[PDB]
């Protein structure tokens, strides 16, 4: 809000090719997992049966070869990160002040002064926006009726974003896999903004805003495991769906990713 | 495969397995 | 990379593909599976010729195992001239049981050949060229031991007999130095060859293990038929023994070719013991013994009984005067019975080749574990080490 | 639910054998000869009870009897309550799909309606799927379509028309999941066969054509009976995929996008479109 | 004008011998040593005039040595003009093809009959080429055909059927232009299930080698309307492609190529064909 | 090592038409960012002096209007992440010991029987790779002559790459802007491995890596703070020639992004 | 290095105008009237010893002079050791570029040889531009020329030729910074020309063509001299862009990429190409 940028001011740069060619590109990795498509899809091109052979694995620079300077784990001085949640329970109430708390340290500096982030972005950009989404009415809320918020980093606070009921979030959310996620409190929706990822660097502004949502899930993630949650990255949903849902506009936002938070038992 | 009903004289195992959302 | 799906009714295979690598200097790696119709055909170096490689390794293996149909069926005197015909009986006399009377008035399956020096026309029998159990079967009691030695493939005929000479040299300087422990000369372990990919697998060996270089081509033939040896005792290596052979005008070349062959033996069992596959998975028998030779003794046993005839270590890969002479000329002062078998097929307005060099004054396949005419014009029983007479060469 | 799939089942003197997409069986059992052939008569879905009473009829253990139709890829059996409750297919050309309900049944897919677009009181239920084939193409007739249904509670459209020597179906234009409508799609393509080599349409030509009222019809061949027949097949495929026995599955990052198909090569195309900037279908 | 076929010639001392697609012929004339010579590195064009020149220059009878040259496969005598005047549709559901041949007048194909295969005392004229067309597959119906119409000039045959969820469009097969048959195909694929280095005991060969021994057809999977009318137009479509074409305006790949269409995807697998050398058609 | 997959076993499941899409995609965001090229190239399509209005802002769902959730920044328990580091000095000797701390706490987990790694990834499938590349003659060294390394993240081991000089690597990597850059001790060049990315998910598994990406250097940013390392994230370089130099192969993997590290003085 | 860029100095009457790209000037001082009209004869560099010389005879100050001359576009100072110190034309149509040595100066583009195609011995010094440019395309040609020079220092090549109704510069292939290749630019543009609307150009029938020697020639219309008029100006501007007087700098993204310009509608398209997958440019 004393941050405020126009939309407007990014467009006078955009390169409508570049623009075209991305989302055209970018679509071509939207999904659509519905509950109701489950028998007439899939997901994973690897059988089931041999996607063991694939997971923590390492792919050599000389395969074959067994030659390598040995680290020590004694150097270690970090906690393992918690197993990523899943059938998560909401049966217990979960208060706004600890969802407060993940924002606040994800994506902000302890300094509301400040316009400095706890992760790097080209440019300074920041061409990625963290929406939040409420999935249980055991999660405490700050406007009742109103289950989207979008969280503005430097300000340091939520703007209301859409009063779509709990049900209809976590549907569009949650695609086709929703009885093995079980039950999460909330969602974090991270978003890019095209011409904001695209106007200064053009291409490789895209890969630097895919790159910074990773950096954002990641803060959030090790907030998450100090603060008592559980979370896990998710990209098993319909993204056109999740952005109507929100009322997001395709045209010049899209979903890259949701990440889920709850209670596991 | 074997039955009282009759004997397999062949399969399609590529979309039999099918009949080259996580982890495993 | 590549990555070509067939219909399992389509004529083509099941796949294929260039595996990635990371690293720009390791050869490219290519790939067809087949289901079981053949067992994977591969190759490996270059990219281009990989891809060329395993393709025509595919048609090669697809050719002599599933497609052929013999053209008749004759006595060995109706089927050549008379002398070819005597070389084959006493080939023949050794692999069976059988009286010289029963190899004579056996009718067998027939193919097309001829010969090697005179273009003569001819047939040979079927069941030596043909690799399944139908073909010729009411051959197989006179020879049951069969295999691809000497098969090539390629676009024009002069190619695959080239194909076919370089291997039938190969295999028959293999059993020849397999059976007497004799090689001609031994290149520097620590040679090197100023072309990356080459060097870069000799680099890796090296500090995996150790390696022994040999000149083992038959005595006073031209060109070089190089063997490399790989060993190691390193206890978290799947890959405890490997080898490669080739066979070329050019010695630099032959040791090229030959580092990269073990390499590609060396890769694929690795992939395969990594992979945890089963030994129910394995279907030829020639790569269940070489799997059964993966380990140190293959390598000392190997080089603790090669006698050199030059104890100086070459330095470097220069030609010398034997390099040069008539490879023809020597194999017919030897013997005149050597044949090729072909076959052709149309491909657009091209014929591809498949060509199978034989001799019965050679050794007929490479498992003297089998039954096999070990009496022949390079080799008779006793001449080398008696162990090794009766056993297979660690070799694919 | 119970999806007779495609096989066949035939004799000549003592020996029958049964081929399906999965497999061949040498039938030996007088009892599953009978249950096959009154499985291959019927119109893609049988009541479980109705199977059960077939299987009884011949003496055989239902679950062995079942175990066996499902393994050798006779039937199969789906749990999945489906997005769109019903099809129904409006067209200028009715007479084409005038025994498409009836035979399509086969292949599971359910038609309620074929409608002639000069009907007026064109009435269409909730969740249901609205096909929109036109071979003489005008931006009214699929305007005139939203207009009347978009807001249908769990509506979703396709549309099919020529354009060229292509036929082309758009992906789903669904505004529930919020895809791209007929308009995005046609955009797209009529963008891409401008040949000013630039993927980005957008110039002072178009835009002072922009201010003229939004309007068109399309070039496209000569259509004969065999290119309507190649049509045919390929809505009718499209719906099986998307409402009816799924025979192979689709990847869920192509299942609702267009789907074009050249004319002359009968080579396919199926690719997804993004929204168009100039369209208004995501507002509504 | 000559198409100059693929072939081989290999010299050792004064001893030559030639191989061609069909033949292996000792050539012990120095005339036709150098004709052949020539004719290797000509790549695969050559025109009467130059011919005739060359084997008057070898000192070879123009006339014993184009025979020599056409009979062991070095040369065949291709059209300039197309090589099919016209098709016919032979098929076990000829009311399939009802209106098609008034209908594909306007596309530029012209069929001049359907035929039944059920009936005795089937005729066709020169230099047309023969669709095959069957719902119900066996190997003996081919047979049938390409034994009663292999020897009418100019003639060619093309094949299709169905095979599981697919259908097949066979290439072209002309004697005349030595190209692949229907068997190079199929009988190839059964000899490589037949001689599998390991046989897949649940090999579709099974059901195909048991249809032959009970004297039954393979027939087409539960097909409707919509099938049909999709095969229809393939089959029109691939008949326009083999309309108007030579071997001076066209290319051989057009006939040595295989048309498979997956049913239920509707995706063409376009692949090459190739030659059996165990095939008969070679014989 | 005792985690090694074979490339071969993943590229049985990949989509040519995948795989050449992305990478024609991926392609238009690689730079040519040489100092040979300085005055006859630009990189910022926005002039110098109107980026100031872009960077450090806040878009809106709803512009113009101001009425926001606060949240209290006495909810934040972290430290201000450091401004990233320019000029580097490499005055000092830089151990392996730090350089092996950094790598553990990265990306590895303090049990080396676990293969759970401190950041999380799609399918398991952990597409990118690691790879350390030594720019200065003060910064230690495991092999002498060896200046690119690949980090095995479970096995927690070196694997030699190349053995180019230093000056080669830091000028393939610092592009045009090397002045500015000064002399940095040590770089991260995080690679994705196209198959690997794809195989699974298609499309979407392009965007699963490019965050993943983020994830990585996101942790190396909060390591290398805490261990006293100076970072920048980096993005000026051209990619073709960092491939080259680190001996890659770039039809199978590519640099998305290096990461500068050092001492500032 | 100071660079004279494109500018005219008119005169009628007592009135004198300078016009440059970047403005315009009413020019009142006969000293810099002088000075700018010998700047018009000049070509291209000019020693800045000559230029504060031209300076001093019109007697006007050095700095205010040279402030001049930048800010109104006339010259610009450039400080970049820049990476091919040198250009060649290697071609099979020398004749076309006759002049080209000598008219390019003016651009601030140095090619020191011309060199036809069919010499022996044809020796090329390092951290050389080598231009390869084909009317009569054939790829041993361009095989020749990579055996020849790939090895040589800081050696990069360029390769034009036509293709169809297009005239195609490639990228510039530089094994110093791993850039693709001739090759992986033909079989782009090859697989793309199939009618077979698929990006992946891998099929069995692409496979039975690569066991032959790989060679080939291209179909393409037949050059008259404004096509190769074309042709010429597309050249030197991509010389001047890589080597010469910059006037506009290209994005870091599209600087090394290839450039194809249809000759019927005269219509430019800038694209990197990824490296072919059966090439192995890579390797080398
Ligand atoms: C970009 C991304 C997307 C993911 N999407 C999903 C998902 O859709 N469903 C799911 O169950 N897990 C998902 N995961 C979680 C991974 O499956 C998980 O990180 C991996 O299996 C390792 O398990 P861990 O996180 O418990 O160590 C995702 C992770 C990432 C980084
Ligand atoms: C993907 C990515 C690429 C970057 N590339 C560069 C670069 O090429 N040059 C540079 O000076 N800084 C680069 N940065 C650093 C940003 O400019 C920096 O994060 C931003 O200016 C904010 O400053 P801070 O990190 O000191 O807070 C990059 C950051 C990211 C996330
Ligand atoms: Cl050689
Ligand atoms: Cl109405
Ligand atoms: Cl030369
Ligand atoms: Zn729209
Ligand atoms: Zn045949
Ligand atoms: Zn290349």
Known sequence: ?265 | ?24 | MINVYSNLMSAWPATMAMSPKLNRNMPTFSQIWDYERITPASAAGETLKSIQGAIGEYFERRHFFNEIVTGGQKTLYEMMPPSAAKAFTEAFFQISSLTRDEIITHKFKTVRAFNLFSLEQQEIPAVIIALDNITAADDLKFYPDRDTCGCSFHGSLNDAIEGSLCEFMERQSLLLYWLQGKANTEISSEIVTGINHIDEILLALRSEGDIRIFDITLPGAPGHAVLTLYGTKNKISRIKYSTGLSYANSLKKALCKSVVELWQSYICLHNFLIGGYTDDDIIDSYQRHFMSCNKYESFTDLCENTVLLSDDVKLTLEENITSDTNLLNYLQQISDNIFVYYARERVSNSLVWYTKIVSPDFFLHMNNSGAININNKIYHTGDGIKVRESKMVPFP | ?284
Chains 1, 6 share one sequence.
């Open chain 1, 1 to 265: 809000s004393k941050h405020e940028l126009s939309l407007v001011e990014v467009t006078h740069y955009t390169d409508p090719e570049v623009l075209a060619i991305v989302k055209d590109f970018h679509v071509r990795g939207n999904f659509a997992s519905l509950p109701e498509f489950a028998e007439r899809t899939f997901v994973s091109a690897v059988p089931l049966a041999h996607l063991e052979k694939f997971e923590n694995k390492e792919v050599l620079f000389r395969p074959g070869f067994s030659s390598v300077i040995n680290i020590s784990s004694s150097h270690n001085f970090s906690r393992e990160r918690l197993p990523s949640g899943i059938n998560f329970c909401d049966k217990n109430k979960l208060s706004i002040r600890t969802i407060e708390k993940l924002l606040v340290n994800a994506f902000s500096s302890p300094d509301p002064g400040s316009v400095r982030r706890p992760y790097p972005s080209g440019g300074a950009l920041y061409p990625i926006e963290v929406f939040l989404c409420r999935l249980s009415e055991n999660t405490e809320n700050w406007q009742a009726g109103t289950n989207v918020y979008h969280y503005l980093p430097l300000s340091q606070a939520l703007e209301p974003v859409a009063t779509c009921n709990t049900q209809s979030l976590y549907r569009s959310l949650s695609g086709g896999d929703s009885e093995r996620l079980g039950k999460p409190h909330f969602a974090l929706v991270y978003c890019i903004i095209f011409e904001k990822a695209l106007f200064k660097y053009r291409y490789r502004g895209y890969r630097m805003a895919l790159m910074e949502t990773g950096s954002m899930y990641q803060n959030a993630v090790l907030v998450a495991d100090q603060i008592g949650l559980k979370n896990r990255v998710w990209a098993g949903y319909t993204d056109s769906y999740v952005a109507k849902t929100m009322n997001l506009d395709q045209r010049t936002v899209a979903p890259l990713i949701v990440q889920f938070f709850g209670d596991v038992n």
């Open chain 2, 1 to 24: 495969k074997a039955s009282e009903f009759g004997v397999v004289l062949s399969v399609d195992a590529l979309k039999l397995s099918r009949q080259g959302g996580g982890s495993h």
């Open chain 4, 1 to 284: 639910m119970i999806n007779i799939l495609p096989f066949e089942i035939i004799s000549r003197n003592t020996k029958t054998l049964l081929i399906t997409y999965i497999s061949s069986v040498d039938i030996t059992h007088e009892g599953m000869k009978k249950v096959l052939e009154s499985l291959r008569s019927k119109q893609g879905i049988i009541s479980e009870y109705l199977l059960d009473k077939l299987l009884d009829e011949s003496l055989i253990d239902k679950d062995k009897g079942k175990e066996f139709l499902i393994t050798t890829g006779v039937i199969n059996k789906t749990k999945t309550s489906p997005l769109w409750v019903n099809s129904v297919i409006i067209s200028d050309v009715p007479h084409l799909f005038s025994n498409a309900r009836e035979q399509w049944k086969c292949d599971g897919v359910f038609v309620s309606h074929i409608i002639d677009i000069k009907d007026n009181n064109i009435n269409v239920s909730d969740s249901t799927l609205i096909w929109l084939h036109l071979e003489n193409y005008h931006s009214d007739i699929v305007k005139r379509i939203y207009s009347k249904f978009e807001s249908n509670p769990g509506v979703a459209f396709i549309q099919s028309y020529y354009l060229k020597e292509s036929f082309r179906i758009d992906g789903v234009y669904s505004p529930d999941l919020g895809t791209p409508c007929h308009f995005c799609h046609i955009e797209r393509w009529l963008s891409r066969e401008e040949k000013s080599f630039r993927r980005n349409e957008m110039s002072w030509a178009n835009l002072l054509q922009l201010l003229k009222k939004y309007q068109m019809t399309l070039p496209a061949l000569a259509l004969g009976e065999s290119e309507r027949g190649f049509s045919y097949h390929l809505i009718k495929r499209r719906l099986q995929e998307l409402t009816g026995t799924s025979l192979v599955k689709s990847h869920v990052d192509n299942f609702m996008s267009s789907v074009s198909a050249d004319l002359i090569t009968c080579i396919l195309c199926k690719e997804p479109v993004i929204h168009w900037q100039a369209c208004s279908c995501l507002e509504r």
